Amino acid sequence: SNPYARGPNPTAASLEASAGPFTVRSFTVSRPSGYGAGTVYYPTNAGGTVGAIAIVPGYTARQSSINWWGPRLASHGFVVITIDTNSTLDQPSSRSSQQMAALRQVAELNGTSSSPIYGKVDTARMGVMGWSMGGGGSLISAANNPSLKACAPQAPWASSTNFSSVTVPTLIFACENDSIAPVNSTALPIYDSMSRNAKQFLEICGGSHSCANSGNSNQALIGKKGVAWMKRFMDNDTRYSTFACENPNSTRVCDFRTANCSA
Ligand SMILES: [Cl-]
User: Fold this and answer.
1) Domain assignment present for 16
2) Looking at the domain assignment, is residue 178 inside a domain?
3) 208 is known as an active-site residue
4) 125 alpha carbon – ligand 1 mean position (Å)
5) Could you tell me where the DSSP H helices lie in 111-168?
């Protein structure tokens, strides 16, 4: 019996819906430590400690670009911190540092009796997500910190595509028509570089660079996949093996690839 399993048995429908089982609240971090600003989203009623995920935007972008993930993930049983970077013009390595600073601060607040998330986090179970350079920053975080349980960047941008050292389970969301971080020269070579992990490549048909951002038209699919990946790998929750590993057989997806990921 898995000590990290939370919530009811999943269905496609429950994972495609606006929200999972748990009530979500949020708060602004009053004194961000090592990054620009943060919002923490958390379940009030998960039934046990949950893992933490830190989410970073792209170059020029702010929390609004990626924060639809906050309630979506938190409602399925995660503490989620969405950040602004110290500068909108921070590069990937800096973004990685800031992402891990955010995780650190979540751990601090877990141990702070006045915090809404006092005692709600399992600080041994953490994941990383982010858009574009924030996606590159997530992969750098995974490479440098292999104790992370999951990595799920979207439209990742990085000046080097070789992430062959990564042992963290990694789901790459790619946007087919991305002109900023082109699938063929960024997301795909990243994906292909990783031979040591569970990994997945999901390309959204016709997607611009912002295809997985807040307000996108594919929240059912993208949120199903993001939540299933985090549940399978952050919580070791094999109820989610099929959702995490399966080809979703969607006309919204124009390329699907996965490895070391059994349904
Ligand atoms: Cl970017």
Assistant:
1) yes
2) yes
3) no
4) 27
5) 133-144
Give me the number of domains the chain comprises. 1
- 105 belongs to a structural domain: yes
Give counts: helices (H), strands (E), the chain: 7, 9
Tell me which method was used to determine the 3D structure. Answer: X-ray
Residue 110 C-alpha to ligand 1 middle, in angstroms? 31
Resolution (A): 1.6
Centre of ligand 1 to C-alpha 241, Å, is 31
Written as one string, the DSSP assignment of 193-209 is H--SS-EEEEEETT--T
Q: Which domain covers residue 157, as residue numbers? A: 12-259
User: Which H or E run includes 233?
Assistant: helix 219-234
- Phi/psi for 85 (5° steps) reads -80, 160
CATH code: domain of residue 167? 3.40.50.1820
Residues 244/262, Cβ–Cβ less than 8 Å: no
Q: How far is CA 49 from the centre of its chain?
A: 18
